[PDB]
Structure formats: C-alpha cells, structure tokens
Amino acid sequence: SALEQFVNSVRQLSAQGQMTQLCELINKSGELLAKNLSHLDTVLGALDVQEHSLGVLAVLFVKFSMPSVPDFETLFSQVQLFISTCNGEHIRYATDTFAGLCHQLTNALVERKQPLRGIGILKQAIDKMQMNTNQLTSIHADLCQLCLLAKCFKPALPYLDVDMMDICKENGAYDAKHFLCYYYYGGMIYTGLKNFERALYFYEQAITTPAMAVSHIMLESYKKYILVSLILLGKVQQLPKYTSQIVGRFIKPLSNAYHELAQVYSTNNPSELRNLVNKHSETFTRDNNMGLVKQCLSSLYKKNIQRLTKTFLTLSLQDMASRVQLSGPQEAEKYVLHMIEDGEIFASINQKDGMVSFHDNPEKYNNPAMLHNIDQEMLKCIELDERLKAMDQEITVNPQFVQK
Amino acid sequence: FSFKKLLDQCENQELEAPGGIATPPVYGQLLALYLLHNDMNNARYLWKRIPPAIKSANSELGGIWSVGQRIWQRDFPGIYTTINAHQWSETVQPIMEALRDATRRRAFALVSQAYTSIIADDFAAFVGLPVEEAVKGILEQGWQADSTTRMVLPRKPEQQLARLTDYVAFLEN
C-alpha cells in the first residue's frame, strides 16, 4: 500500500538528479519496511539495478537474526548479483550502507564457516567503491580476513601490493578497528607466504597507529612484529619516533616472553633459545604464534653460518659444525647446501677434502643489467616526488590555508 | 608456456565457479601443478583447506601430497621414488612428466655451483640416474670425472637518450 508510493518515488526521483533527497528519504528507514519485500526487489532494478536495492538489502541482512531466515541461498544470490552489476557512480553517494552490507555478509560467512564464496564478492565491492586504487576502504579489512580464515592468500595479493595514500571517510563510520585490522591481517598474510620484509612493514603500520587505550589487535601486532624482525633481521628493529606512548607503557610489559626471546636471540647460542621456547611454551602457543617462534630457532643457525663468512676463507665441515653447534659434518653439508640454493650465502662445498670454501664476491657493478636496477629505483622515486607535489598543490590552493 | 594458463584457469574455477567446494579433478590438478612451479607455500595451504571429505573419498589426492613433502623436506631420491609410485587418469600424467624434467634440471643446477667435487654415488642420487649411466653422460657437458675413486668435478658452464632527457627535465623541473 504505502510502499507503492515509496517504490515509485525512487523510480521517479532517480534518473533525473535530486540525489541529495534520495539518500535523505532512504535514511528515513520505514520501520522494518514490511520485510516481505523480496518480490519488489527485482522490478525496482530498472536499468542497471538501482540504489534502493542497497537500502532494502541492508535492512534485510541485519535483522540481527535469521539473516533472512533460510532464504540464505536466495539472499546470497541477490547480494552477489547486485554487487556484480550495481554499476553507476551513484553507489558512491552512500558508502555508509554499502560497507555495512559487506561487513554483515563477511560476519555471516565467518559464522557459517564458508569464507571462500565471499572472496570473489569482496573483490568487486572494493573495485566499485573506491575512487582510485590507492584509497583504503573499510572493506579491505574484510577481504583480508575472509582470505585468511580460508587459506587462500593469493587473491588478496593485488590488494596488499598497493601503497595506500588515502583513506575513505565513508561518510561517517570507519572506526580505527578497520584500519588496525587491515594492517594486521595483511601482515599475517605476508608472513604466511614468507614475505617478511613487507610483513614487518605491515605490522609496523599497525603498531604506530595513534592511540590512547590498549586494544587487543595492537598487542598481537607487537608480539608478531618482534618475531618477524628477528627472522628477517638479526635484531628487533626500532619503532618510528612518532609511535604512540601507549605501546611503550602497557603494550611492552604485557609482552615479556617475546622480549626475553629477543634477549636470548642477542647472544648467539641455540642451547638457551631451545630451552626458552619450551619454558615459555604456554605463552607462545596461547597467542597462536607457535611455529613462527621455531622459525627464529632455525634462523639462528643460518645467521651464525653467515657470520662465519666474515672471518674465514676455507673451513672444515667437522670444524664448522662445532662453532654453530650443528653436531655433525653430514648435517652441516645440507645446512650449507640449502643456504646456497636460497641465495643466502656464497660458498662451495668440496666433498673430497670435505671443506667449505667461502667466495664473498657476488657482483662488480659494470653490468648493463644493473643499470636497469638503478633506472627502476630512480623511476620509483620520480613517481613518489610527483605524487608529493600533486598532494602539495592541493594544499597550496586550500582556502583554509590562506588565512593561517 | 601452457601450464601457467592451466594454473590460472584452475585458480578461477576454484574461486568463482563452485559453491564453496570445487570438484576433485580441478582440486588435484591445482595441487599437483603448484608443485611443478615450486610454490610449496601455496600448496601447503591448498592441502590444509581441502575439506576432509574429498580426502577420504578421492584417495588419489592423498598420493599427490606424498610427492610434495619430498620437495618440502628437500630429498631428491625421495622425489624420484615417490613420483614412480602412484598413477592417475590423463590429468596429472603430463604434470608429472614436466615435474620430472624440472626436478632433474633443478638437481643439475644445484650441483653446478654448490659442489666443486662430489662423489659419483651421491651425484647419481641427486640427478636420479644409475651411477654408470650418470658418469658417461656427464662427460659430454665438459665436467671432468676421475675414475677409480668416483669423484666427479662439476664445472661451471634502445631509448637511453630519451631516459637521460627525462631525468634532466625532472631535475631542472
């Protein structure tokens, strides 16, 4: 009855402008909107669907119960079709219910334990809600969790290799939880694929978030930051100067096992490290990062062997497997061979004499291919400077930056 | 070549084609094709996300994650032994016909700069050939063996002017 006036209004208000009042009347709710609207959804979608479908589906999905009851397959199909072919720039006028719909879908999928169907849905929603590809949206924190609870790390790689330079305001909302979760789950994904250089960066961008209270998403971004820094480098990297003081007041004392682990991973001695992993085995397995700690123990040997290259020019395998405590020339042979195969060391084995000869002569910079490296590194800085100038001229002409 | 296209095809048919779980054919094809490209990090998660129903019904997949561990804990004789253990339909036969060549080339490239003198017996296990057949075929490449002791010695085998102008135009603005 009354809905017929509401449905027709969106039909006539749209396709002729008046987009400001459209979002106003959508925000007028409708008091459960007579939830049986499943029939009118298809007809209302004149041309490339419409915008009122988002308003209907947002109310439908969060009835805080029985999503839409067992209409799930139909509800999921409607959501998938809408997101695939919503089209239009109009979907950017209301980036407050779109993100809410995607978040509700993510929560329902996580609860129902099928976080693989939604990886394909939150790939067009991200693509069709951000201005450019360098803008962080609140949906980026949903895909990075859907593809993490359902081990499928590669779909998220295109959305983690972009250096974000803008954050969507989403017309309200966008609490710091989304920003912290994106830069924590991205770090976890990169750690899972053994890309530690960027996992460390992603964790660091979550620790240094401005804060005044302790959140249990920044604790398990310092605990893992320590381990990833100890694996990638030989020591815990220094956090940036602008780090919030809350990390250095409550976060640090709460993580005392990991600082002790770094202390032991400061004097090169695997005997104490192996004992410390077992003594604190409750903490390291309660935080779920047990397995990222054994990587530190395995990396201590690989660090010691590399430290042998700074003093020796030819070592005996039996003699080598007595300073790094490998207990056997046969195992030291494979330990060196694995490191040679991975490009971590420059050495050669001699099974006749049984001796490892360290070369320590990778490259002389007279290669026409190194010129390509310098050219690429120069082009990246050129693009970076162009970006800085571009988002500096936008401040130079700001009417607020003429009065001060 | 052609295997990368197959890989991305199975990736797409895993993501968007099914209702959460794909067919055992494409599942096993992707699992075996990840090993060919040496992507063990992705293969471990592919095996970890497989539902515990295809595993207990299509047991052949459990065979494929019997080669993988051999690549995981690097063991060339284990790889060669395990490859020649099981068999499936015409979906992994050309997969484990290029995997053999890839592994045998990886072994040759491994013992070409890591070792400067290696026993022939160990080299045979590395490459995956009988010792007598391995030594005779070595000599063609130029690697000098040494008989009566079996110690094979492996032997090692357009717009610049525009770019410079672009750099100058940038520095001087």
Partner: peptide, 24 residues
C-alpha cells in the same frame, strides 16, 4: 619546461584570486 611553468603560473594565479576574494 613550458608545461611545468604554465602549471606553476596557473597555480599562482589561482592563489592570487583566492587571496583577492578572501577580502570580503
């Protein structure tokens, strides 16, 4: 070079216009 100085002069002209209209 010509494009860069045209852009710089246009930004300066915009800033000057903003300064002028700000006197209201």
């Amino acid at each position: 070079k010509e494009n860069h100085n045209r852009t710089q002069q246009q930004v300066e002209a915009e800033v000057t216009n903003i300064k002028k209209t700000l006197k209201a």
